[PDB]
C-alpha cells in the first residue's frame, strides 16, 4: 500500500452534465466555445482557470481513443479535435470532452493515458500536438463561418449547430489559425504531448 498526497476528490464540474451541454457532432471547436460561454456567464468558476485545447498535427490526422464515434479499443482519426481544460484550485487538471466515452469531466492523467496514449509507439507524423488558448482569449478571438463543413456546392457535410456563426469585430473565419500547430500563427501556446503533460500534469 502507498498513501497518495485533496480538493480533486470533491471537485464540482464547471459544465452542466454531458446530456445538458450545447453539442453538435463534428463541431467540437464550437462545443468547447459554448462551455467557455457557460462558465463565463455563471458564478461557479473564473475563465482564468480554463483553456480551449486544439489537438492536431501538420498532416491534420490525429488518432484519439475512447471516442463515442467508434466504441471499441480502436482510435478515431480526426483532422483536429477540441476539448476544455480546467485547472482546479488545488492544481489538478480536468478535461471536458463531450465526444469521449471517458467520464465528463475526466482527470487530466486518465485522459492523456487512455484517450491520447503514449506518442512513442505511434509513427511520428501522427503524433498529437496541443494548442492551449486561455478560455478568455478564445471567446475574444475565435471566429468560424463553418465554410470548412460545406462541400464544393455549399451543402452541409454534417448538420450545423442551431445558432448563428461565432464572429468577432476582427474576423468572420480564423479556424485554421487554431487548427495550425505552427507557433507563428494564432493565439496561445503550441505544446508537444511531453510539454502538454509537463505543464498540466500532477
Short mmCIF file of C-alpha atoms in Angstrom, two decimals:
data_model
loop_
_atom_site.label_atom_id
_atom_site.label_comp_id
_atom_site.label_asym_id
_atom_site.label_seq_id
_atom_site.Cartn_x
_atom_site.Cartn_y
_atom_site.Cartn_z
CA UNK A 1 0.00 0.00 0.00
CA UNK A 2 1.02 3.69 -0.53
CA UNK A 3 -0.53 6.98 0.75
CA UNK A 4 -1.02 9.49 -2.14
CA UNK A 5 -0.74 13.29 -1.47
CA UNK A 6 -7.15 16.65 -1.51
CA UNK A 7 -9.69 19.02 -3.23
CA UNK A 8 -9.86 16.95 -6.51
CA UNK A 9 -11.74 14.18 -4.54
CA UNK A 10 -14.73 16.63 -4.13
CA UNK A 11 -14.31 18.50 -7.50
CA UNK A 12 -17.62 20.06 -8.72
CA UNK A 13 -17.88 20.06 -12.56
CA UNK A 14 -17.74 23.52 -14.29
CA UNK A 15 -20.29 22.43 -17.01
CA UNK A 16 -23.85 21.06 -16.93
CA UNK A 17 -23.99 17.22 -17.18
CA UNK A 18 -22.91 15.82 -20.63
CA UNK A 19 -26.53 15.48 -21.98
CA UNK A 20 -27.47 19.12 -20.99
CA UNK A 21 -24.49 20.73 -22.86
CA UNK A 22 -24.86 22.50 -26.25
CA UNK A 23 -23.40 19.84 -28.63
CA UNK A 24 -23.18 19.31 -32.42
CA UNK A 25 -21.20 16.27 -33.76
CA UNK A 26 -18.04 17.37 -35.76
CA UNK A 27 -18.12 21.00 -34.33
CA UNK A 28 -16.02 20.33 -31.13
CA UNK A 29 -14.40 23.84 -31.57
CA UNK A 30 -17.95 25.31 -31.10
CA UNK A 31 -19.00 22.80 -28.37
CA UNK A 32 -15.94 24.00 -26.32
CA UNK A 33 -16.63 27.72 -27.15
CA UNK A 34 -20.13 27.12 -25.64
CA UNK A 35 -18.61 25.50 -22.47
CA UNK A 36 -16.44 28.71 -22.16
CA UNK A 37 -19.54 30.99 -22.56
CA UNK A 38 -21.43 28.91 -19.89
CA UNK A 39 -18.51 29.20 -17.37
CA UNK A 40 -18.17 32.99 -18.12
CA UNK A 41 -21.93 33.70 -17.56
CA UNK A 42 -22.22 31.53 -14.35
CA UNK A 43 -20.76 32.32 -10.87
CA UNK A 44 -19.00 28.94 -10.11
CA UNK A 45 -15.51 29.32 -11.75
CA UNK A 46 -13.47 32.07 -13.50
CA UNK A 47 -12.40 31.69 -17.20
CA UNK A 48 -8.79 32.45 -15.99
CA UNK A 49 -8.63 28.78 -14.75
CA UNK A 50 -9.81 27.36 -18.14
CA UNK A 51 -8.25 26.70 -21.59
CA UNK A 52 -9.52 25.71 -25.03
CA UNK A 53 -7.21 22.87 -26.23
CA UNK A 54 -6.96 22.19 -30.01
CA UNK A 55 -5.39 18.75 -30.75
CA UNK A 56 -3.91 18.38 -34.28
CA UNK A 57 -0.62 17.97 -36.23
CA UNK A 58 0.91 19.26 -39.54
CA UNK A 59 -0.84 16.49 -41.63
CA UNK A 60 -4.19 17.06 -39.73
CA UNK A 61 -4.57 13.31 -38.91
CA UNK A 62 -4.54 12.56 -35.11
CA UNK A 63 -5.64 9.24 -33.54
CA UNK A 64 -7.84 9.69 -30.41
CA UNK A 65 -9.02 6.62 -28.40
CA UNK A 66 -12.17 6.40 -26.15
CA UNK A 67 -14.21 8.40 -28.77
CA UNK A 68 -18.02 7.80 -28.94
CA UNK A 69 -17.92 7.85 -32.82
CA UNK A 70 -16.06 4.46 -32.56
CA UNK A 71 -16.95 2.37 -29.47
CA UNK A 72 -14.29 -0.40 -29.14
CA UNK A 73 -10.49 -0.33 -28.40
CA UNK A 74 -9.55 1.38 -31.75
CA UNK A 75 -8.99 5.13 -32.47
CA UNK A 76 -10.99 7.80 -34.36
CA UNK A 77 -8.62 9.61 -36.82
CA UNK A 78 -9.66 13.32 -36.57
CA UNK A 79 -8.34 16.19 -38.74
CA UNK A 80 -8.48 18.08 -35.38
CA UNK A 81 -10.33 17.77 -32.02
CA UNK A 82 -11.06 20.39 -29.30
CA UNK A 83 -11.58 19.86 -25.52
CA UNK A 84 -11.84 22.18 -22.47
CA UNK A 85 -9.12 22.05 -19.75
CA UNK A 86 -9.95 23.34 -16.21
CA UNK A 87 -7.05 23.70 -13.69
CA UNK A 88 -8.88 23.26 -10.29
CA UNK A 89 -7.76 25.33 -7.21
CA UNK A 90 -5.50 22.53 -5.81
CA UNK A 91 -3.63 22.20 -9.17
CA UNK A 92 -5.44 19.06 -10.53
CA UNK A 93 -6.43 19.48 -14.25
CA UNK A 94 -9.76 18.15 -15.66
CA UNK A 95 -10.57 17.51 -19.39
CA UNK A 96 -14.14 18.27 -20.67
CA UNK A 97 -14.62 16.26 -23.94
CA UNK A 98 -18.31 15.83 -24.94
CA UNK A 99 -17.13 13.17 -27.51
CA UNK A 100 -15.15 10.87 -25.08
CA UNK A 101 -16.61 7.60 -23.59
CA UNK A 102 -14.43 8.52 -20.53
CA UNK A 103 -16.15 10.43 -17.69
CA UNK A 104 -17.27 14.07 -18.32
CA UNK A 105 -15.24 15.62 -16.83
CA UNK A 106 -12.11 13.39 -16.68
CA UNK A 107 -8.90 13.70 -14.56
CA UNK A 108 -6.10 15.01 -16.84
CA UNK A 109 -3.76 11.99 -16.26
CA UNK A 110 -6.53 9.45 -17.23
CA UNK A 111 -7.49 11.43 -20.40
CA UNK A 112 -3.83 11.57 -21.56
CA UNK A 113 -3.20 7.88 -20.57
CA UNK A 114 -6.43 6.39 -22.11
CA UNK A 115 -7.63 8.89 -24.84
CA UNK A 116 -4.24 10.20 -26.15
CA UNK A 117 -1.84 7.38 -25.04
CA UNK A 118 2.00 7.48 -25.50
CA UNK A 119 3.26 9.16 -28.77
CA UNK A 120 6.29 6.74 -28.64
CA UNK A 121 4.83 3.64 -30.50
CA UNK A 122 2.87 5.89 -32.96
CA UNK A 123 4.56 6.72 -36.32
CA UNK A 124 5.95 10.23 -35.54
CA UNK A 125 3.86 12.11 -38.22
CA UNK A 126 0.59 11.01 -36.42
CA UNK A 127 1.91 12.44 -33.08
CA UNK A 128 -0.52 14.77 -31.23
CA UNK A 129 0.30 18.48 -30.66
CA UNK A 130 -1.77 20.80 -28.40
CA UNK A 131 -2.66 24.48 -28.97
CA UNK A 132 -3.66 25.79 -25.49
CA UNK A 133 -5.60 29.14 -25.53
CA UNK A 134 -6.79 30.82 -22.28
CA UNK A 135 -10.63 30.50 -22.46
CA UNK A 136 -10.98 34.35 -22.22
CA UNK A 137 -8.68 34.81 -25.30
CA UNK A 138 -10.71 32.00 -27.06
CA UNK A 139 -14.04 33.88 -26.51
CA UNK A 140 -12.36 37.19 -27.62
CA UNK A 141 -10.59 35.96 -30.82
CA UNK A 142 -12.32 32.75 -32.20
CA UNK A 143 -14.41 33.12 -35.42
CA UNK A 144 -15.85 30.39 -37.73
CA UNK A 145 -18.22 30.88 -40.75
CA UNK A 146 -18.38 27.00 -40.85
CA UNK A 147 -17.19 27.15 -44.55
CA UNK A 148 -14.95 24.08 -43.79
CA UNK A 149 -18.15 21.99 -43.18
CA UNK A 150 -19.63 22.67 -46.69
CA UNK A 151 -18.84 20.60 -49.86
CA UNK A 152 -17.83 22.20 -53.24
CA UNK A 153 -21.56 23.07 -53.93
CA UNK A 154 -22.13 24.59 -50.42
CA UNK A 155 -24.07 21.60 -48.93
CA UNK A 156 -23.52 20.64 -45.21
CA UNK A 157 -21.25 17.57 -44.66
CA UNK A 158 -22.64 17.46 -41.05
CA UNK A 159 -25.72 19.31 -39.68
CA UNK A 160 -24.75 22.78 -38.35
CA UNK A 161 -25.18 23.91 -34.72
CA UNK A 162 -28.60 25.51 -34.03
CA UNK A 163 -27.32 29.15 -33.54
CA UNK A 164 -25.65 31.76 -35.81
CA UNK A 165 -21.89 31.51 -36.67
CA UNK A 166 -19.45 32.81 -33.98
CA UNK A 167 -17.75 36.03 -35.28
CA UNK A 168 -15.69 38.94 -33.78
CA UNK A 169 -15.03 42.59 -34.86
CA UNK A 170 -11.65 41.39 -36.32
CA UNK A 171 -12.68 38.17 -38.22
CA UNK A 172 -15.60 36.00 -39.51
CA UNK A 173 -13.25 32.96 -40.04
CA UNK A 174 -9.84 32.15 -38.42
CA UNK A 175 -10.47 28.43 -37.50
CA UNK A 176 -7.30 27.43 -39.50
CA UNK A 177 -5.21 29.67 -37.12
CA UNK A 178 -6.34 27.39 -34.18
CA UNK A 179 -6.03 24.01 -36.05
CA UNK A 180 -2.47 25.06 -37.15
CA UNK A 181 0.22 23.76 -34.71
CA UNK A 182 2.60 26.50 -36.04
CA UNK A 183 3.62 28.89 -33.19
CA UNK A 184 3.96 31.77 -35.78
CA UNK A 185 0.10 31.55 -36.28
CA UNK A 186 -2.88 32.32 -33.97
CA UNK A 187 -3.17 32.63 -30.14
CA UNK A 188 -1.97 30.67 -27.06
CA UNK A 189 0.95 28.19 -26.92
CA UNK A 190 1.69 25.05 -29.03
CA UNK A 191 2.93 22.04 -26.99
CA UNK A 192 4.18 18.54 -27.83
CA UNK A 193 2.46 15.78 -25.75
CA UNK A 194 5.53 15.91 -23.39
CA UNK A 195 5.27 19.74 -22.98
CA UNK A 196 1.43 19.44 -22.51
CA UNK A 197 1.67 16.81 -19.71
CA UNK A 198 4.63 18.69 -18.10
CA UNK A 199 2.54 21.95 -17.97
CA UNK A 200 -0.82 20.45 -16.76
CA UNK A 201 0.10 17.03 -15.21
CA UNK A 202 0.24 16.45 -11.38
#
